[PDB]
């Protein structure tokens, strides 16, 4: 398959890894901080997803330095991964239009 499709698949796998790792690390970073809510794994996984998609409801978020650092990694991974899917779609469309034009 073409590069853009391979890259998209890879990006998806990497994002899943980051969501899982981010959830584990977020709990690790936040427990020990009075008042923190990102402290159990199931909801931390949910938090990682709404952060990677940049939805950010505000129901859960990190209060510590390391939790916030983990958060930035999750954000960047989500933004870049979805952006890469967009880039792959554009490449697919560009190629199809070239053909349709007989170029």
């Amino acid at each position, epitope marked *: 398959s073409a590069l853009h499709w391979r890259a998209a698949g890879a990006a998806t796998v990497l994002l899943v890894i980051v969501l899982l790792a981010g959830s*584990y690390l977020a709990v*690790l970073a936040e427990r020990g*901080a*009075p008042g923190a*809510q990102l*402290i*159990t*794994y199931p909801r931390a996984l949910w938090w990682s997803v709404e952060t990677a998609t940049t939805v950010g409801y505000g129901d859960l978020y990190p209060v510590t330095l390391w939790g916030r650092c983990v958060a930035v990694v999750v954000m960047v991974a989500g933004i870049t991964s979805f952006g890469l899917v967009t880039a792959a779609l554009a490449t697919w469309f560009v190629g199809r239009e070239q053909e349709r034009r007989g170029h």
Partner: antibody
Framework: QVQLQQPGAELVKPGASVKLSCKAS????????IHWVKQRPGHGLEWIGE????????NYNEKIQKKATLTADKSSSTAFMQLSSLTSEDSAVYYC???????????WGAGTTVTVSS | DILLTQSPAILSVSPGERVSFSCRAS??????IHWYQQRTNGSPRLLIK???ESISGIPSRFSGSGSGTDFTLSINSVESEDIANYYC?????????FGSGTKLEI
């Protein structure tokens, strides 16, 4: 079978210290946290602290004087709590409990009755 | 730190009657409350998780309800084996905390 095994009792001279143990069996996951809870005779349950074996990180109750130090041995699947410079105020039953990272203590040890006396 | 208030501290009920234990949290904690039973000379035993979820091995007699700041542990038709101390515990915010406990008397 018993998931958490703790010694029945420990006698400690005032000022001295002791190391309590909690041997765990059954399913074990990287998300497991081992907690320690203190209970004075006739009184309620007081959270002491927690440790995550898969990483070695430990957190403690900030409201009370820190008497404990938590450690864990992955190979022997054993968690330890070092209580130091104890006084009669430290005499109590100390329970270890297992939490699967989801907030509740699914299982508890039988508890170790610690007595601080000469 | 979240304060869990269990009042009254002692509940007196007649055999077979329905009883309800109260646990009030100092702030809203959704349904992140769990209940434990501790009989004389025994270790705590998990009865209900996340305010209303059943635990395998626990008599259907036990149920839980509530969300926010007010929670209830109910026993339908109490019997002798139910005599013990009951504690609530929250896991919504760090650190986890316990209520002061309620004793069931028959």
């Amino acid at each position: 079978q018993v998931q958490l095994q703790q010694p029945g009792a420990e006698l400690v001279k005032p000022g001295a210290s002791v190391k309590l143990s909690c041997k765990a069996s059954g399913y074990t996951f990287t998300s497991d946290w081992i907690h320690w809870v203190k209970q004075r005779p006739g009184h309620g349950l007081e959270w002491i602290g927690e440790i995550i074996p898969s990483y070695g990180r430990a957190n403690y109750n900030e409201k009370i004087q820190k008497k404990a130090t938590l450690t864990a041995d992955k190979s022997s699947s054993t968690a330890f709590m070092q209580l130091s410079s104890l006084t009669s105020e430290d005499s109590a039953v100390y329970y270890c409990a297992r939490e699967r990272g989801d907030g509740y203590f699914a299982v508890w040890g039988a508890g170790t009755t610690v007595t601080v006396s000469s | 730190d979240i304060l869990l208030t269990q009042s009254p501290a002692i509940l007196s009920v007649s055999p077979g009657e329905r009883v309800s234990f109260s646990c009030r949290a100092s702030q809203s904690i959704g349904t992140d409350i769990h209940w434990y039973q501790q009989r004389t000379n025994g270790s705590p035993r998990l009865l209900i998780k996340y305010a209303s979820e059943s635990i395998s091995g626990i008599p259907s007699r036990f149920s839980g309800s509530g969300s926010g700041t007010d929670f209830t542990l109910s026993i339908n038709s109490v019997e002798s084996e139910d005599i013990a101390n009951y504690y609530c515990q929250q896991s919504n915010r760090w650190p986890f905390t316990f209520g002061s406990g309620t004793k069931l008397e028959i």
